[PDB]
Each structure stands twice: as structure tokens, then as C-alpha cells.
Amino acid sequence: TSFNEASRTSFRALPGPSQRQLEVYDQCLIGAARWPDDSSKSNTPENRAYCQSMYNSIRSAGDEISRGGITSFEELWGRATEWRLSKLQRGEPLYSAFASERTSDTDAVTPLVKPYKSVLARVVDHEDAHDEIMQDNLFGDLNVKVYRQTAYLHGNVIPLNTFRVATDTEYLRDRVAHLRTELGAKALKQHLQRYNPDRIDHTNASYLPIIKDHLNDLYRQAISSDLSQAELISLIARTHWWAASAMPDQAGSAAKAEFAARAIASAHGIELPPFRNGNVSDIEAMLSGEEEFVEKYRSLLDS
Ligand SMILES: O=c1ccn([C@@H]2O[C@H](COP(=O)(O)OP(=O)(O)O)[C@@H](O)[C@H]2O)c(=O)[nH]1
């Protein structure tokens, strides 16, 4: 019904970011990772500045969306990515990872070491955790609690993230002492970047093309001008879930997914509050099925 000449695309105008804004205290928590075992990083002035910048840029992106200036999820992710890159320090060796999509000839692993240790209990006490045994060229056989996150896409049920937590605590202490003595602390740390017994094995990058296409489909639904509030919050939660669980980039995906979900909300005049202390949104996504995440999304938010 309207036409954006700069993006050369027809769109239905949305209200855009709300005039009533979050309090500054909340602005400075947008995008924070408020771990339950340690929320202290989120109190520093550096982190507060990072978060308030995210908030301001989320609102600017919401304005672009409301005017037809961002026309696909991939473009919104690009905005989030360039914003995230701007916060890296001069010289950052991870700059390329923050700037780059993951590729298939790579596996991606998050060892569940600091700051992720609160996740170990969440896996062990998970309703959907299964007991399994994993074979391992350095540790041998290990009892693990495993959560296998899955997704429904066009009737294909695909594996997303797999959490493994090894439960033989004393045997592990023992076997790591052996490994450290035989290999050195840094070299073993290098091996465990991929094979730490406690870890998340991330969504295979081969799924990223179809997930990226699905995110574009969700975005097209989400910029509709005639959605109910429940429909809209459901679409925002689904977009967040898919983008965070896909983990499309070598670094920074959690920040980019939260940026994008909040920008979609802001385009509709919704000013979403911070995630509650203790709720790290990408981790909550990866630890749930999609419909479960949609049904609890509001409760993850601080009101
Ligand atoms: O100075 C910073 C940088 C990042 N983050 C947040 O910490 C999380 C980091 O996860 P992400 O996947 O974005 O980055 P990566 O784990 O690849 O470094 C995200 O919620 C960021 O918004 C933060 O609170 N402060």
C-alpha cells in the first residue's frame, strides 16, 4: 500500500518505536547476559554502555522496519551484525568471526565452562534429558545427560543443538589430570575446545540455508500490519528462537538474534523490557522446543 523508494519495495506502514521509552536502568540491560551464577559483568559501565547502544540501535532498526527500509530478515541480521562489530576493540582477532557466517566444513562447539556453568544443572535436570553413553578418543566411555533440541520445518524434524553433560565427576577429575600431565595445559585446552565432555554441539551449518529462508518467511509474517498482540509476540518469540538456536555466525549470534527480535517488536511500537536476571535468552532458546519457548517468552521478560 505504501512504497519505499530507497529499498524499492512495497510495504504496509507500522507505528514505529514507542514514544514512551524504557527507563535508563532498563535500557542498560538490553542485550545483557545475566547469568544466574554471576550477573556482575552487567553492572560495569562498559556493559551498561554496550546495552544502551543496543537499545538505541534496536529502536533505529524498528523505525527502518516500520518505514519499509529493511525488507528481509537477512538485512535485519546485517544491521545487527554491523552494530555488534562496532563494539569490538581495535585489533580484535575475533573480528572475522563476528563478521562471518558459519560454514559446513566446520563443526561448532561451546564448551560448558565459565561463564556457562549454570547450564550444567539445566541439562541434568531437564525434563527431556536422556541418559546416553558417548565414546571419546581421550576419555573413553562417559555417562552423559543429553538434551537433543529439535525443530519442525515443513514436516522435516531436524536436530538443532545437542547439550552433553558428563556425570562421572570423580572419574573425570582423574582422567583430566592424566590428560594434562601427558599433553600440557594449553594443548589439552585446545583439544577440549572441540571435545570437552561438557559441551553444546551446535546446529549443523548445513541446515543454515533452509533456516535462513524460514527466518525470512517469519519476518514477512511479522511485519504484517493486522496482527493481534498475541500473534505478534508469538512471531517475535519464534524469530528469536530460530535465530538464536540456528547460531548462524561464528560469533555474536546471541546478540544479533536478540537485536533482531527486539527491532521487530519496536517496529510495532512495542518496547519490550530486559530479560529477567538469570534468563540468558539464547540459552533458554537452545534449551527448549519452539512451541515451549513461545509459550514462556513473556515470562522470560522482566514484566
Ligand atoms: O560486552 C558485551 C558483549 C556481549 N554481551 C552479551 O553477551 C552475549 C554473548 O553471546 P553472543 O553469542 O552474542 O557472543 P559470542 O558468545 O559469540 O561471543 C549476548 O547476549 C551479548 O549481547 C554483553 O552483555 N556485553
Residue numbers in the entry: 16 to 318
What's the publication's text?
Structures of AvrB + RIN4 [similar to a reported structure (19)], AvrB + RIN4 + UDP-rhamnose, AvrB + RIN4T166-Rha + UDP, and AvrBR266A + UDP together contribute to deciphering the catalytic mechanisms of AvrB as a rhamnosyltransferase. All the other four subfamilies of Fido domain–containing proteins use diphosphate nucleotide charged cosubstrates for catalytic reactions, and an ADP molecule could be soaked into the cosubstrate binding pocket of AvrB. Under the condition tested, ADP did not cause an obvious shift in the melting temperature, while UDP caused an obvious shift (~+0.8°C). Thus, UDP appears to be the nucleotide capable of binding to AvrB and may be part of the cosubstrate used by AvrB. AvrBG46D and AvrBY65A both caused a +146-Da mass increase in RIN4; however, coexpression with mutants of potential catalytic residues, AvrBR266A or AvrBD297A, did not induce a mass shift. When RfbA, RfbB, RfbC, and RfbD were coexpressed with WT AvrB, but not the R266A mutant, we observed RIN4 rhamnosylation.
AvrB, a type III secretion system effector from the plant pathogen Pseudomonas syringae, is a member of the Fido (Fic, Doc, and AvrB) family that triggers HR in Arabidopsis plants to ward off systemic infection. Our investigations herein reveal the distinct and unexpected activity of AvrB acting as a glycosyltransferase that rhamnosylates residue T166 of Arabidopsis thaliana guardee protein RIN4. By elucidating the crystal structures of AvrB and its substrates across different enzymatic states, we provide an explanation for the specificity of substrates and delineate the step-by-step reaction mechanism executed by AvrB in the process of transferring rhamnose to RIN4. The identified biochemical activity of the avirulence protein AvrB as a rhamnosylator adds to the catalytic versatility of the Fido domain–containing protein superfamily.
